[PDB]
Point group: D2
Chain length 115, copies 4
Amino acid sequence: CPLMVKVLDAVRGSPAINVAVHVFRKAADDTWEPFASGKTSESGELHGLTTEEEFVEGIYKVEIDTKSYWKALGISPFHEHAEVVFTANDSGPRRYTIAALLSPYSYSTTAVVTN
Amino acid sequence: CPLMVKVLDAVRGSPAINVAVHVFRKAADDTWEPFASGKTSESGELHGLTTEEEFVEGIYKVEIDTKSYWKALGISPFHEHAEVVFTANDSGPRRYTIAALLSPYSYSTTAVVTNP
Amino acid sequence: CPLMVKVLDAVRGSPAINVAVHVFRKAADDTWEPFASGKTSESGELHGLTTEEEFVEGIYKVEIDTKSYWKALGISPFHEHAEVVFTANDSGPRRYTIAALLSPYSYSTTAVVTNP
Amino acid sequence: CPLMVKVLDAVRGSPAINVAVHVFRKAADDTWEPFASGKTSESGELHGLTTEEEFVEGIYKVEIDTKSYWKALGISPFHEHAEVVFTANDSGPRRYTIAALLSPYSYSTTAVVTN
Ligand SMILES: Nc1cccc2c(S(=O)(=O)O)cccc12
Ligand SMILES: Nc1cccc2c(S(=O)(=O)O)cccc12
């Protein structure tokens, strides 16, 4: 698992469950091309998005569908989505965890890059 | 001033100065059109991006050029930029402050929305 | 103003108004002595806690009464308060802004330290 | 494991390793009484601080020794420590994870309360 996503809900102090995540790779013509997607699990986690063979160096965007999440909980949110854009590298450590903490009018995102 | 941006640097405990910021508005045809741009001042603030008249309802993208900023300080950051996407003025005119806190491998962004 | 506090509410996208704040200073005998206190205004800011003269070198604790704040809004938060502990003025007089961002189960705090 | 701590380093995008953590319980006389302590592991995690039988309802303080961490990395930090104070409850979900993200002049902390 080269690329994992974990989402927390700062209002409820819980994993953010069933949040849609879409990942895009930047194409030579500078458009965003769908790459991977899924929904966070009961633990707020999304694994198995890609494989080591497919996850080549490149610029990637992870789009977290936060608006839909809040709407489903009946809470009025500010953002359309959270949007994490980064270069995936071959000589940084190998596993990328994109973590995201969600509030209605705020979010943070952290990259955890390890062996 | 209906749209302002304030950036702090979490490594130095200071405003983040000279941070480039590009603002886009989603057009009818669903492309991002350039809307406004600027750079944060020595107080880490960016004012005067737009006017009440020009800042109509729509979906806006505020792109904070975090990688350029860290690289100018000799840090290799994780993110290309922070991307703040939101609907604005759907319930009438509001004033928005987009606040961002920057670390090399992390950032947060908070919106303060007030009714003038 | 050498010590100021600014609080935002991450649920409402607004300044956090009427947030109680208590400041302590570690005494020679290692107890926390009361130093200053106040409440954030409608802009979520708290000024005038202390003076340049009284704000000497030492270890300070800024206690932001987050539980009282959320409870007054009918939210049951996780934390009793946010506790910001730091050495101040060890390299001469500085000006400190303690910024805090509040969610019911999360908070962050950032220091902006400038040399006047 | 009723109480776990996980610490991340926002400068390096890594677990914060070997960070001392001291936990205190508030006594009837309102002083803080040592309760548990340890150092984060290679994954930035600290488990086995307490047991379900010992972790009674009460006010607890988790003190994260952030100053020492930064000092060891040669980076000048603002805080003496990060300080997470909370009431432990019997009818909230059972497992508490105190998460903390560290920067030299900033930190955030999040409570993840689950089954
Ligand atoms: N993370 C933050 C918390 C509280 C306030 C913040 C501000 S501001 O209040 O100075 O506009 C700016 C950037 C980040 C902040
Ligand atoms: N698993 C996690 C550990 C430590 C911090 C985390 C954050 S945070 O940095 O925004 O608070 C967000 C999501 C997961 C985290």
